[PDB]
Amino acid sequence: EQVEILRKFIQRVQAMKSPDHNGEDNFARDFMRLRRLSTKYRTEKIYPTATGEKEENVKRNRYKDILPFDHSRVKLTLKTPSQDSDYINANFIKGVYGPKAYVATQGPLANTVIDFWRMIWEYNVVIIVMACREFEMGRKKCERYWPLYGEDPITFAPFKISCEDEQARTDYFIRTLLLEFQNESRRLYQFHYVNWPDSFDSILDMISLMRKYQEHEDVPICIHCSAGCGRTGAICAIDYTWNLLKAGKIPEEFNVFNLIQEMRTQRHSAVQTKEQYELVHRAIAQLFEKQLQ
Amino acid sequence: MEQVEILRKFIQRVQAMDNFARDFMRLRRLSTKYRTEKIYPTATGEKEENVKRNRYKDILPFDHSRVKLTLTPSDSDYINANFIKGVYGPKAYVATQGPLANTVIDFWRMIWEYNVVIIVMACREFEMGRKKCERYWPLYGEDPITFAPFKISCEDEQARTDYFIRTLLLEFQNESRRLYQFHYVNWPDHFDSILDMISLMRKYQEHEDVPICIHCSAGCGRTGAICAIDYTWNLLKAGKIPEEFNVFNLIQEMRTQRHSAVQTKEQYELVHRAIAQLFEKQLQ
Amino acid sequence: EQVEILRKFIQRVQAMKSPDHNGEDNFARDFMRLRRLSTKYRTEKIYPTATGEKEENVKRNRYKDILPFDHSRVKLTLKTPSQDSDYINANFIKGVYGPKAYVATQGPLANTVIDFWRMIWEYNVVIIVMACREFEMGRKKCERYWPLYGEDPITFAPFKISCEDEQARTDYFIRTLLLEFQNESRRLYQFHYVNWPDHDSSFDSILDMISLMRKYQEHEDVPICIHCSAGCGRTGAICAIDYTWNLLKAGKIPEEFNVFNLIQEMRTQRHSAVQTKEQYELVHRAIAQLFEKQLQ
Amino acid sequence: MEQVEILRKFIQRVQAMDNFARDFMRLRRLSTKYRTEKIYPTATGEKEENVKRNRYKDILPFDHSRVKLTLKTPSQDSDYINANFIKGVYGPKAYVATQGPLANTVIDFWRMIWEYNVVIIVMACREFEMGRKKCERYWPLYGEDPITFAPFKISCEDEQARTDYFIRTLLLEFQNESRRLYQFHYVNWPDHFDSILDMISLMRKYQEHEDVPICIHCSAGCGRTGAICAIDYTWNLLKAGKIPEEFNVFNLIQEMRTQRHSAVQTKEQYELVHRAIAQLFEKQLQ
């Protein structure tokens, strides 16, 4: 029964914290293996990234080491006067109920904000989760593609984006946006998490509140950080498990390593560091604990 | 069952087909029977204040498919204009009348709010000692004509066979926009150049993701014929010509989106022939 | 004895919290008087604002009701190719040791960022305290005059400003800036408080910001620049507290210590220094907190 | 006490004074003494590296007052230009006195205009004089396409003809920032006033203050340059009502000659400064 499964996971995670005889805990080691698995898949050419590495698309990638898998990449069939390439650096990730629950994508560049919106429009996305800041550690991480609350609307023809409300919670904002295109308009919600801890209350909070805005998985939710993996992947993994949980459906053979490993076959480096890998485990452990009265 | 077969039959029947006049009368008859049970009303267009925005008292835009404007310092949602669906986009074309002096403003309200980039005009400002269309562009070299809040200026021209191509710009609140007006100044009222124009126009915009604005004087007739041909050509290129493909049904369907889409048996006949040309031109 | 004086203020502040027969506590009532006094001074023409209201300076004022007193207004004698007017919406406020401990100023407009920099330079300012966000309540409050950390340097000829470091603390940031002019260079420290709280002890982050800022500048030999949107309210709130904390640190809280008087006096130097009764209460509670901290 | 009186003595003494040549000799002798006796060194200027950045191997910029360039280019890296700051009535950098640039230094020159936010350039010589090249033309002529000097660029934008001088409006770009400028080109130095006095007072309509330097230069960056500074500086003291009781040209020039080498260069320029300043004074006394 769920209770036995939940307690087992919690005790498991508790044990994973203990260092090796070589000073490496389970998070460290599980993570190495994840990294080895990715090399394996690459070198067997199981998950090629051919489109992303074409000479045309180099200018459309934020980091030359982060490329979208061909098999799961988001294709832009909606065209504009200025941009008609189907290429964006983003991939679909499967959710608890099936394909396309998430779209994980890089933080847009100046020349790809337009593609960002083409994607948001074509795929009927309502929810945007941003988990980086525009600037971090002295470096630019993401183009600001949303107007500040009180700013005049911003034009990325043929798109028009306006911010009609903002709301502050502990470590994040919720911006209500209006996206307009050719006489149509769509209200979006952007959840901007601005405080990352490379305990997890603000993230769990954000995720549940976000799921009150979009309860279902009928249109993908869009999640990006700077590269579109790392934090992005940590967020998907927790959201996913939380849905499982709430659906009262934590499967007996629940294995987070397997969830992340699979996620990593749909978005390159989905969860990117061992620190993130531990985060996901502890946050779920906390979820499980709460539900355990 | 297969593209190449389907095509050759068509060129077959359209080599026989005056049964054109007769098929057309059948269309006009079906049309009228559509303006009786009133399956497609034009309420908005025949309201008091809108009489002034209509070039012809008998050409009113179908309510269901009409283009609404919302973009001024003065503010109606009405313009005599309808969307026509393309192979995939429900707003592939906008078919509208030639603007009147007092509507040219709504015209740009429309060109702007809908992100349009291609304008196809198929009439002359004056035809047969009659005004047909308010010249809404600056002549190549003339100063930027204004239409507050819209500013619009020519920027180039080019003389293809029976038509011209004008690179225009259009400002409004320190935003800009380059447009291309294709102006066919020579219609056969009573092909190559039409076929040539559409293909060149489709080098400027292959897709249907923003509307292409088309218009003659009444905004149907020369307009309808062109939409029909371009639509079929796109269907042709995608290799999607359906088995029982048929101009009659094509035009009828179009006529439920834009009042009297194709206006004369002469246009109707021209549609058959340009398409047949395309089809045969495709079997090398 | 300091202990007696400190305890008396705390107890006084506690008593000010209780509403009277008409529902108004001492904060509300003191504050009414401050407003009455300001209008008294206006109408007796004791503190004219003639310069700020000349036709030519209307475009240089964020809010039409907030004008700099002539007598204490900051004059820009440093001229630039683009701007040679001496006018900026800003005043000096006296500190514990004499004139010019503070410069209170509005958040620069697009057309006055250049005046903001002329002022910062001419007056050898090092510390800047910003206590509003660029937008609030869906309105624009302040022109962004600082480059973001990692952003390319920004130019307002003839000044150039760079951000070389940013530091996050609870409810504020500390940006290390470099201001350059004509081949010269000065390091600035901007303290940007982004989380104003009307009220609530409580106020911990405000006190933190202040004491930390005071480690970057112990002395009062050049003015500290403080601004919010209007350059009063939060600005005045922060001066009063910083002012008292210095007094306190110097172990110098006078017997006749009267915050009403401190603020009243400030209001004759910067129009509406402390602008609402909520801020008025805030100043009292924050100091009360300081006082008990010191009492252990 | 009393400007008007102080102003009087002067016009007096000047109409009384030849004694200019004698006074100037005393200046040159005092100067010589001030390099011996190396009271103001120009080590930087004398180094082998910069020998090619100097128009004259005789005119070196005092180290203490020389204008250092630190706007690194792509890439001239030296912080050397043959130029000195001269104090104004209140600003330590009211003026820059430099030599007319050489072909290889026209770049440093614009590095200087740019890093110091200059706006007014005063040129007091011609490209060619007396059969000799005096100064590299660093500006585009009215009409000509924008000239360029990576990583700079500079065009023209108008020209005007006052009496003995021109007024050239220019733009100058550098990483698409941009700046308007005003070069006053005096093409008729008699060496050997109205027109000089006229030019200075026009220039001071364009920029009254001393908060960005005015760049002045002839060929060597002293002589016509120094005289113009002396006059402008005195005029500003005149207008401010600050003419000191003991005011005199000898001490004015001496002091100037501790900031830019051999500031006023010929006894004819020395005499010129005297007579222009007298003219200015008799004007102030209505």
User: What would the DSSP string read from start to end of D59-74?
Assistant: ----TTTB-------S
B265 touches chain A (CB under 8 A): no
- What does the domain layout of chain A look like in residue ranges? 1-293
Secondary structure (3-state) at A62: coil
CB atoms within 10 A of CB C41: 16
Quote the strand ranges of D99-251, DSSP E: 120-123, 128-129, 132-133, 147-149, 152-161, 165-173, 179-186, 214-217
- Of A61, A65, A213, A197, whose CA–CA distance to A131 is shortest? A197
B window 196-255, beta carbon within 8 A of A = 205-207, 209-211
B121-124: list long-range contacts, CB under 8 Å, 24+ apart. B121/B181, B121/B182, B121/B183, B121/B184, B121/B215, B121/B216, B122/B183, B122/B184, B122/B187, B122/B214, B122/B215, B122/B216, B122/B222, B122/B223, B122/B226, B123/B98, B123/B187, B123/B215, B123/B216, B123/B217, B123/B222, B124/B185
Question: H or E segment at D8?
Answer: helix D3-16
Per DSSP, A151 falls in state: B
C194 touches chain A (CB under 8 A): no
Task: Tell me the shortest Cα–Cα distance from A98 to chain B, in angstroms.
Answer: 27
What b-and-e string marks burial along A11-44, b requiring 16 or more CB atoms within 10 Å of the CB? eebeebeeeeeeeebbbbebbeebeeebeeeeee
C window 38-57, beta carbon within 8 A of A = none
Question: H or E segment at C157?
Answer: none
d(CA A177, CA A165): 7
D1-286 topology per CATH:
Protein-Tyrosine Phosphatase; Chain A (3.90.190)
Q: Say whether C142 is catalytic.
A: no
* A158 to B115: CB separation less than 8 angstroms, yes or no: yes
Per DSSP, C57 falls in state: G
β-partners of residue C166 are C175
Q: Which residue has the tokens 């209307």?
A: C58
Q: Do chains D and B touch (3 or more CB pairs under 8 A)?
A: no
Is the peptide bond prior to B211 cis by the omega test (within 30 degrees of 0)? Answer: no
d(CA B220, CA B212): 14
A window 151-190, beta carbon within 8 A of C = 151, 165-166
Cα B131 vs. chain centroid, distance in angstroms?
19
Per DSSP, A248 falls in state: T
φ and ψ at residue B209, rounded to 5 degrees: -80, -20
d(CA D46, CA D15): 42
Question: H or E segment at D136?
Answer: none
Mutate which: D117, D177, D204, vs C, most C CBs within 10 A: D117
* C158 to D93: CB separation less than 8 angstroms, yes or no: no
* Residue pair A172/A202 in contact by the 8 Å Cβ criterion: yes
Q: Do chains A and D touch (3 or more CB pairs under 8 A)?
A: no
d(CA A209, CA A193): 13
Structural method: X-ray
- Of C105, C109, C71, C114, whose CA–CA distance to C223 is shortest? C105
A81 touches chain B (CB under 8 A): yes
Is the peptide bond prior to D151 cis by the omega test (within 30 degrees of 0)? Answer: yes
The answer for residues whose C-beta is within 8 angstroms of residue A139's C-beta and 6 or more apart is C150
- Give the number of residues written for chain B: 284
Q: Which of B91, B175, B209 sits opposite A80 (nearest CB)?
A: B209
* Residue pair C89/C71 in contact by the 8 Å Cβ criterion: no
C135 touches chain A (CB under 8 A): yes
Which of these CATH numbers, 3.50.50.60, 1.10.3720.10, 3.90.190.10, 3.40.190.10, describes C1-296? 3.90.190.10
User: Which chains, if any, share at least 3 CB pairs under 8 A with chain B?
Assistant: A
Task: Tell me the shortest Cα–Cα distance from A137 to chain C, in angstroms.
Answer: 8
Secondary structure (3-state) at A91: strand
Catalytic residue among C132, C225, C228, C239: C228
d(CA B220, CA B254): 10
Secondary structure (3-state) at C12: helix
Please enumerate, by residue number, every residue of C annotated as part of a binding site for substrate.
35, 62-66, 198, 228-234, 275
d(CA C27, CA C14): 11
Q: Which of A78, A79, A183 sits opposite B113 (nearest CB)?
A: A183
Structure tokens of D118?
A: 């200059």
Catalytic residue among B133, B154, B216, B227: B216
β-partners of residue B183 are B121, B164
Question: H or E segment at A113?
Answer: helix A113-122
Quick one: angle between helices D249-256 and D19-33, nearest 10?
30
* Residue pair D215/D121 in contact by the 8 Å Cβ criterion: yes
C139 touches chain A (CB under 8 A): yes
Please enumerate, by residue number, every residue of B annotated as part of a binding site for substrate.
28, 55-59, 189, 216-222, 263
Q: Which residue has the tokens 């801020």?
A: C279
| CATH class of the domain defined by B1-284 | alpha beta
- Distance separating the N- and C-terminal Cα atoms of chain D: 19
Active site residue ranges of D: 218
Secondary structure (3-state) at D281: helix
Q: Which residues precede a break in chain B, with C-to-N distance above 2.5 Å?
A: 17, 71, 74, 190
| SS3 sequence of chain B | CCHHHHHHHHHHHHHHCCHHHHHHHHHHHHHHCCCCCCCCCCCHHHCHHHHHHCCCCCCCCCCCCECCCCCCCCCCCCCCEEEECCCCCCCCEEEECCCCCCCHHHHHHHHHHCCCCEEEECCCCEECCEECCCCCCCCCCCCCEEECCEEEECCCCCECCCEEEEEEEEECCCCCCEEEEEEECCCCCCCHHHHHHHHHHHHHCCCCCCCEEEECCCCCCHHHHHHHHHHHHHHHHCCCCCCCCCHHHHHHHHCCCCCCCCCCHHHHHHHHHHHHHHHHHHCC
Task: Tell me the shortest Cα–Cα distance from A157 to chain B, in angstroms.
Answer: 8
C-alpha triplet D221, C185, C142: angle, nearest 5°? 125
- Of C274, C264, C266, C253, whose CA–CA distance to C287 is shortest? C253
For C18, left (φ over 0), alpha (ψ -120 to 50), or beta?
A: beta
Half-sphere exposure of B189 (CA within 13 A, CB side): 9
Q: Which residue has the tokens 């990638």?
A: A61
Per DSSP, C109 falls in state: P
The answer for residues whose C-beta is within 8 angstroms of residue A130's C-beta and 6 or more apart is A107, A142, A190, A191, A192, A193, A224, A225
* A79 to B117: CB separation less than 8 angstroms, yes or no: no
The answer for residues whose C-beta is within 8 angstroms of residue D19's C-beta and 6 or more apart is none
d(CA C42, CA C137): 30
Annotated resolution, angstroms: 2.0
Q: Which of A78, A155, A183 sits opposite B114 (nearest CB)?
A: A183
For A183, left (φ over 0), alpha (ψ -120 to 50), or beta?
A: left
CB atoms within 10 A of CB D101: 24
C-alpha triplet A218, A221, A223: angle, nearest 5°? 160
Per DSSP, C98 falls in state: E
Q: Is D55 one of the annotated binding-site residues?
A: yes
| SS3 sequence of D79-111 | CCCCEEEECCCCCCCCEEEECCCCCCCHHHHHH
| CATH superfamily, region A1-293 | Protein tyrosine phosphatase superfamily (3.90.190.10)
d(CA B163, CA D53): 64
Catalytic residue among A132, A142, A225, A236: A225
Structure tokens of B240?
A: 């999607």
* Residue pair C176/C165 in contact by the 8 Å Cβ criterion: yes
